[PDB]
Design an enzyme around this catalytic site. Sequence first.
Site, short mmCIF file in Angstrom:
data_model
loop_
_atom_site.label_atom_id
_atom_site.label_comp_id
_atom_site.label_asym_id
_atom_site.label_seq_id
_atom_site.Cartn_x
_atom_site.Cartn_y
_atom_site.Cartn_z
N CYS D 1 10.28 27.36 20.63
CA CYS D 1 10.82 28.69 20.87
C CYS D 1 10.50 29.17 22.28
O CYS D 1 9.84 28.47 23.04
CB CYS D 1 10.28 29.69 19.84
SG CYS D 1 10.73 29.33 18.13
N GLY D 27 15.29 27.28 22.35
CA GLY D 27 15.75 27.72 21.04
C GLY D 27 17.10 28.42 21.12
O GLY D 27 17.28 29.33 21.93
N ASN D 98 5.57 31.97 19.94
CA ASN D 98 6.01 30.58 20.08
C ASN D 98 4.91 29.62 19.67
O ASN D 98 3.90 29.49 20.36
CB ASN D 98 6.45 30.29 21.52
CG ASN D 98 6.69 28.82 21.77
OD1 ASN D 98 7.21 28.10 20.91
ND2 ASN D 98 6.30 28.34 22.95
N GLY D 99 5.10 28.94 18.54
CA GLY D 99 4.11 28.01 18.03
C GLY D 99 4.16 27.87 16.53
O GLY D 99 5.23 27.97 15.92
N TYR D 253 10.14 16.27 27.43
CA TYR D 253 11.51 16.66 27.11
C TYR D 253 11.77 18.17 27.15
O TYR D 253 12.68 18.63 27.83
CB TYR D 253 11.90 16.13 25.73
CG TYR D 253 13.26 16.59 25.27
CD1 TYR D 253 14.41 16.21 25.94
CD2 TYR D 253 13.40 17.40 24.15
CE1 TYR D 253 15.66 16.63 25.53
CE2 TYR D 253 14.65 17.83 23.72
CZ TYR D 253 15.77 17.43 24.42
OH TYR D 253 17.02 17.85 24.00
C1 LIG Z 1 19.41 12.91 25.56
N1 LIG Z 1 18.64 14.02 24.89
C2 LIG Z 1 18.35 13.93 23.48
C3 LIG Z 1 16.87 14.12 23.35
N2 LIG Z 1 16.50 13.51 22.10
C4 LIG Z 1 15.52 13.89 21.10
C5 LIG Z 1 14.76 15.21 21.57
C6 LIG Z 1 13.53 15.41 20.67
C7 LIG Z 1 13.52 16.43 19.70
C8 LIG Z 1 12.39 16.59 18.88
C9 LIG Z 1 11.27 15.74 19.03
O1 LIG Z 1 10.13 15.91 18.20
C10 LIG Z 1 8.86 15.88 18.89
C11 LIG Z 1 11.28 14.73 19.98
C12 LIG Z 1 12.42 14.56 20.81
C13 LIG Z 1 16.04 14.04 19.78
O2 LIG Z 1 16.66 15.45 19.63
C14 LIG Z 1 17.09 13.06 19.39
C15 LIG Z 1 18.10 12.87 20.37
C16 LIG Z 1 17.53 12.55 21.71
C17 LIG Z 1 16.98 11.25 21.73
C18 LIG Z 1 16.06 10.85 20.48
C19 LIG Z 1 16.44 11.64 19.07
O3 LIG Z 1 17.29 10.91 18.43
P1 LIG Z 1 16.99 10.44 16.96
O4 LIG Z 1 16.39 9.03 16.99
O5 LIG Z 1 16.02 11.41 16.31
O6 LIG Z 1 18.27 10.44 16.18
C20 LIG Z 1 18.61 12.64 22.79
#
Ligand SMILES: CN[C@@H]1CN2[C@@H](Cc3ccc(OC)cc3)[C@@H](O)[C@H]3C[C@@]2(CC[C@@H]3OP(=O)(O)O)C1
Lengths: 467, 467, 464, 470
Positions: D1, D27, D98-99, D253
Amino acid sequence: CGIVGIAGVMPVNQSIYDALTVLQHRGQDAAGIITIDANNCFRLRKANGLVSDVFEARHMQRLQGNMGIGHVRYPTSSASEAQPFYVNSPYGITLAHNGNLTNAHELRKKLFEEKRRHINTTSDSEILLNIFASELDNFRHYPLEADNIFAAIAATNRLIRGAYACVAMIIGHGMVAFRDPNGIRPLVLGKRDIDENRTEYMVASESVALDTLGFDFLRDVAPGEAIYITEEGQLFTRQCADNPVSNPCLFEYVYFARPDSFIDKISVYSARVNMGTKLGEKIAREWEDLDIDVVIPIPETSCDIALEIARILGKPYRQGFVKNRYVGRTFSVRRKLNANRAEFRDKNVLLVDDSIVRGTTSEQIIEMAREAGAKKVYLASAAPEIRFPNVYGIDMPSATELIAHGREVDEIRQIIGADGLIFQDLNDLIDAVRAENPDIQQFECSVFNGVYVTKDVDQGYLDFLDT
Amino acid sequence: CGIVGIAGVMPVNQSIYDALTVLQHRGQDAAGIITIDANNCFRLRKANGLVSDVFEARHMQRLQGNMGIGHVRYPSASEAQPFYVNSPYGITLAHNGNLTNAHELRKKLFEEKRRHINTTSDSEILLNIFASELDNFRHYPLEADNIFAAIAATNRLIRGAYACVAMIIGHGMVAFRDPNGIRPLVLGKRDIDENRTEYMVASESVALDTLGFDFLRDVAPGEAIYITEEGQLFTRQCADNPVSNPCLFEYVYFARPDSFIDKISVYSARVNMGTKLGEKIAREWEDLDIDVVIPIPETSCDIALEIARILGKPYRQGFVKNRYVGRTFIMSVRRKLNANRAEFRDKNVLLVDDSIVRGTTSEQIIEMAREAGAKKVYLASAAPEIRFPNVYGIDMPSATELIAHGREVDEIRQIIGADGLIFQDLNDLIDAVRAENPDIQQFECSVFNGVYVTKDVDQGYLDFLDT
Amino acid sequence: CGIVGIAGVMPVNQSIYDALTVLQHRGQDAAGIITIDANNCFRLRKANGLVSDVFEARHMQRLQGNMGIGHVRYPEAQPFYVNSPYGITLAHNGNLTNAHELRKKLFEEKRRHINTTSDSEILLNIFASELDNFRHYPLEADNIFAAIAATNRLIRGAYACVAMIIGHGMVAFRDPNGIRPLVLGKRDIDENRTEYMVASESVALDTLGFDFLRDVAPGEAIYITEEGQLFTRQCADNPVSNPCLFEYVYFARPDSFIDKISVYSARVNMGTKLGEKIAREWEDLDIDVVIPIPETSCDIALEIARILGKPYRQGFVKNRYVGRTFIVRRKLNANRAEFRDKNVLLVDDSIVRGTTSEQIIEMAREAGAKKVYLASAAPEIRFPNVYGIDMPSATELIAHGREVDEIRQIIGADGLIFQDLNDLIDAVRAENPDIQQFECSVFNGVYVTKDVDQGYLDFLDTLR
Amino acid sequence: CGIVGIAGVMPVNQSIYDALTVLQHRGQDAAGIITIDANNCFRLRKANGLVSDVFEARHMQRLQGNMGIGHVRYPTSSASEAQPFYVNSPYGITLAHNGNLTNAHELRKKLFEEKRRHINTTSDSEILLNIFASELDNFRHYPLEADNIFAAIAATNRLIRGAYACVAMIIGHGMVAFRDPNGIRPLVLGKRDIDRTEYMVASESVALDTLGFDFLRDVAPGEAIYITEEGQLFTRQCADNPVSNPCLFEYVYFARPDSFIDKISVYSARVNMGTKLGEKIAREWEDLDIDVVIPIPETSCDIALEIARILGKPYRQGFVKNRYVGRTFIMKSVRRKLNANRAEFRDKNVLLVDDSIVRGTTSEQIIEMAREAGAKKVYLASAAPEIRFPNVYGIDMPSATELIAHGREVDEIRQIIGADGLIFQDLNDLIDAVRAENPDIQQFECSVFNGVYVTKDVDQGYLDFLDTLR
Ligand SMILES: CN[C@@H]1CN2[C@@H](Cc3ccc(OC)cc3)[C@@H](O)[C@H]3C[C@@]2(CC[C@@H]3OP(=O)(O)O)C1
Ligand SMILES: CN[C@@H]1CN2[C@@H](Cc3ccc(OC)cc3)[C@@H](O)[C@H]3C[C@@]2(CC[C@@H]3OP(=O)(O)O)C1
Ligand SMILES: CN[C@@H]1CN2[C@@H](Cc3ccc(OC)cc3)[C@@H](O)[C@H]3C[C@@]2(CC[C@@H]3OP(=O)(O)O)C1
Ligand SMILES: CN[C@@H]1CN2[C@@H](Cc3ccc(OC)cc3)[C@@H](O)[C@H]3C[C@@]2(CC[C@@H]3OP(=O)(O)O)C1
């Protein structure tokens, strides 16, 4: 603007919705989808705004049918009616259009005088629909044959002047699509086999629309060519122009088109990279005795261009600006862009942008670089000076609003407050694009050199368009 | 449905909005307004729902012009009126009634003129028949005689009942009425100042009163009206054998009481209905004991008052109709009516309702009186038994859903659960209405006697309609 | 404003929705509904607009629960709620005359913030504050009634309230003067399951199939537990029945029974009183027809025509649909056949500003009426109402400072006659003589709540 | 968030709108703004959807005041389930958070059983607001002193457990802001001198930049901030054993590249991630032959560029992101967000660079998109290490039952996503990559990688869980 049509064997409402979304970059003012249901009746939905705003759940359910076309509008007004347009007689015709007619005023007078056909809007897409309509109206047998339709389009290409990529549907016949005799506006043909008995067809302004649906790329619709696809799934092609020639919109490659699109056998990405190679070499020559520390692209069109420029000059490439994925209202480009301060401090920076129209954005982006602590700020424009107004689909400020009008590089530079300003050379731009398809001898570059391939534009028409 | 058209010298957008709001009782399912702006172009807004919902501020700002027509539809998710065609000239039309040969007409329009009909509405059919007739001329502009000729050729083509209003670009507003004068349509004028005079037409006279237009007269059966853009009024009969057979049911229920249809005050007519129903109850139910007469709001309020007078019995408000009615979410007459318990306790009540169609409402209302502590409940219908479907612009259930169909009064009484039931005689009703204008010798009452004035209503179509 | 609370054994979201619709005449400005679900949480939906417009299908699915309360506001909305203690929501119909004092106490004494101007939020907090003094759980019936009794000692004015307390049940109470209406109803499912509800008018009870039990007595409080048990108790010092007289005159529904007085029968009697007065004081009057002004004065003018022996005819037709105007003729239309060359007696229920009457009279002449007379079912309105009735300022009141003839002359009538206050009172009292004194401050300027007179006395002290 | 709080001398509605927009990436499910007007009353607007959708002109005119806070929430019901929340007693307190609280249940009970305070939602932001409120309820004077408020936050910290960065407002006092004892969730402090000094706090520094606020510092772990209505600033340490354990995934990320979180440039960190990963590929993938390095937009773009620089191979845009995605109507493929540039894959051995692998769903589809595009062998490099554990400190991710990297080793994952080769960033390399920009950070919050949770209550509850098995 951006268009799309699909002659399928299954519901195409979601397909066109997805196709328009990958083409949303061609127009964000309005959108429209029109289909033909099982009762040979038109189902229409069109309004202002993005595709995701215009088409809600209840609208999609209403858009039944296996054949349909879609359109997304780049403003020109905004409160006017959007496409696709429709007429009930003869047969029932619908048409979407990307481009601009240069004799729309002349055509509107003919349609009323010679045919008693009323034009309710200021859109020359409605004029095009009626011109095509009146020609189809001369046949009295049924059903129409492919040759009648091609004859009607040929008769339309003789009456209308300008640039146009069109897609249309005729009740009880099928889908038609055609390009102007100069190939100014982009249009590609696609194919998709569901089984050994069923094959779908689609056309779109860019190949990305074909890609995102799983449609196999066939080819570009040739200049002056027309496509006709019966509701039985049959493909007819025909040359409906007298003297066709490939004069594709050069600015499609420079900015407007998607980088992963292939227009007239020319990769937009590669050509765009070649632009950086040209501009990079030019900078190495003209700015030999200047000290530059880093190349910073202005997102997002100039990112891959700025990278190549850095490769040539042997300087480092750095993300100095960050574009916000979302933007808000103010009930000022610093709301789209933010400067990574650590990348400007005490450095001579070369900023790379796709172009310069008014000069407002450039002046501010330079201020941001200096407020970030940049010693010297140099700017490069991926496209040549823009001094003349486009009348083939690209709508822009009046020729006076253009900063390059009656000015030269050093004057344009001093107004935007840059230490150095360098434009791409028009010929280098051509070579950069031609390198991907030498078969193309001449592009359409009116916004740069002021030479119109249609040969029907004077200051009189320009003065008129202002009002 | 309800229609309105105003040919004036001022912005008619608000005046049409107000006109449709006083006609809202004629249709709540959809609404539409179309005008002709200063640039001789149609401005259109139409959607589902009430007039107050359909027309918001931004829509009203769009609807510019000094001339326009309006429509309120009674059913449903289809396209609403008014309809529009860009050729020839540019025409629009709003229509109240029904065409009994619509299917025939749709075929002709396609095979003979190649004109496509996209909707199941015969208002679009009626719009195209008219447009197709105006298509035979090759001069411009048209004269009043030409327009009248096209309308005449139209009447010789279409069957059924219809009151229309239309606009022809660069000409003016036209309005006409079916040969049998079944459907209501009145003409009115307003003198803004000495130099200029406005004209309007509407379904009922209350629309004229609301705007401040002087009531001129009813549009004659088969007659046509033509107001030019310069305010010049033209009139001419366009049917061969005009007759005044106004819908009797407009008087019984559908029209507002303060409306004057064919020189008959709906209010004075409904009083006479009570006069003759009361007199009928006085003789045929002489021995029975009733303590009070109770109206079922709100049509029978003045009718029951008259019945009470004739019987020399007290008139008391036993039922109260909720002015606001909400929804029933999928997550019954009691949510519209409510019994004043005191008025029913230990009493023989006489309920007066305006009609009996399905018989559902009657059953529940009687049961409410029982729960309210009523010894005996007698029901008196202000209208005769309803046995046959209406094909002249009145939507009703199939002939099978009509409780009075294939049954007799006492059989109906047992089902709805009343101790006594009586209907007004069709001849009593006619006299009650004729007493306000003896000139009218016959009425449209096919829902009562099964006599269709057009004579063109055969079996099969009656059985086709159930689709 | 109008309120409703239901304590049932089944989902009540639809029921409260239907109840609010039949009470919609009490407020069209805003509407709100709040229920308690199985997780003992508040599900809330409130916004401006009619009941039909405020609650859509997506909202009704959120309003889960077998208990809840609703509110329609006569021009933030209600209900309000607080999280501590326990969780309390409350809808209120009336007005507090010491709201400023109450708001000051809540901040200085209890540190409770008030964020709106609605004294419903004040009332809610005063009640919540009292409940805060208890530390055991669950609260018992005696604890709650003590809390309400303590509230009645602090607040002043008129109020009919309904409220809920998480994990306890529904409560409802009425001011010490019984000024604002409030009724109690029941509904038996089986012998062991009985639903209860309260509302501003009995019509809400009838529409849902609830049996009418009785008017909630002045100062009395009601309590229904989650388990469906009923508790009643007098939570006021020296309660009295001073029901709002104007409820019977206009605001209430004719099929409502307020304090054992049929509103309909009351409005008939008013016509009888007003008709008899015209026979006496206007003996030379030559009228051809008696015409009512829709829709409240229809059965009043009907009685007036009876007493006068004159005919009664629908001269005006109100449009059933509201029409917005962008940037009275809109609602009323004259049946120009019932006025033409006649001396007419128009019957309206009241005169406040004098705007409506003036235009209506002009409409009568426009229809060709020779002489236009005007009879008002209610006496002259000269004083402000501070007990929960929305009316324009006293400065806008046309009857204030002016006499009957001057009034008649401003609205341009050939004759203007008002209902006499005592005649009006007898008309209503005739239904239930147990009611000695009504709240009719708008007419005579007498304010039954003792707090109001002292406020004047302190106003005088400021003028020195 | 995402959260933001501005304390100024001019209307802050537009300022908070602009701030939330540049934090929208934290978010997009819902948003809410709340201000204090001239009458010392709360103005609130909150609902589901993007910031641009939630706040129309009519809502903006009601958000009057010179002090306020905002919030953007990631996907979890009603509009009352969004932030910020608000309580009228005592004083009137609002708070945005946020948390995530790891002891929300026991806190819900104590609030009810001890203070009779009802919780109506599932948000532990409302919990955090009521904890802080009941502590402020212990004082019996007015107004509260800065010392009184700080004391309340301290008692709050000893009660609650987990990760949190908060901003709150108290009627007739001013803006409060604080951070958890472990400094997991990010929070920065900034100023603006108009002649009088304005103060703001936000999740990322980019919010400060876009509004023209000067950057002061990160809010210290366990520290609190108090800004009065008159513009006086107080700071205090409200944690007993404060430590800097910044969320490691912020740098990977979630954080914007142009943000500086704990003196660490997120962009410089990701470049370093590319360096460490590129070096690992050159070591362990000696023999394997690739023709081009292709990033998966947009996070891994600059990372892939560095990896390619290290590998001495070309960098080309094989994938293009659709900047506009739409609804898929009933009656979800990655092609809606990604398209392949067919020419860059055709007859090539490509190295794909994605920022992470969670479920393995996305990766599998993107690999196939490359295959059909003409690619011979498709290799996949992940900027982040294997994600084997659920995050309970405010990061939203799929259920731990969907984590493909759990109980599976690299080669098993490779053949499930159908890659010709798979390689993950080493956690040690990653930690060195970020810690290189600020060596004084010794330990990060990377429980999603190593299963080490810095807050003791988690590891304690785990043993309490194991006991239930017997
Ligand atoms: C190019 N930008 C995206 C960023 N990505 C991640 C971002 C992320 C969200 C939560 C999290 O928990 C700590 C860690 C990372 C995931 O949303 C998705 C998609 C993607 C890459 C790997 C995953 O794909 P999945 O293997 O879960 O289907 C692409
Ligand atoms: C990062 N990319 C942006 C998009 N660019 C162009 C795109 C463009 C659109 C139409 C056209 O037809 C003639 C030519 C160019 C302009 O929208 C804007 C901004 C920008 C560059 C120069 C202009 O700004 P201006 O110089 O007029 O203030 C930056
Ligand atoms: C209080 N006024 C209402 C209006 N009435 C009619 C009006 C009506 C509509 C069409 C028509 O053409 C055949 C004839 C009459 C019906 O809407 C309803 C209800 C009602 C009376 C009989 C019917 O109820 P039903 O008998 O079908 O259950 C009461
Ligand atoms: C028949 N329906 C309306 C009933 N009337 C009253 C009802 C009313 C409202 C508030 C109130 O508080 C003291 C007392 C009475 C007024 O709404 C209006 C309109 C109306 C009549 C006299 C007034 O208009 P005004 O005299 O101010 O111009 C017509």
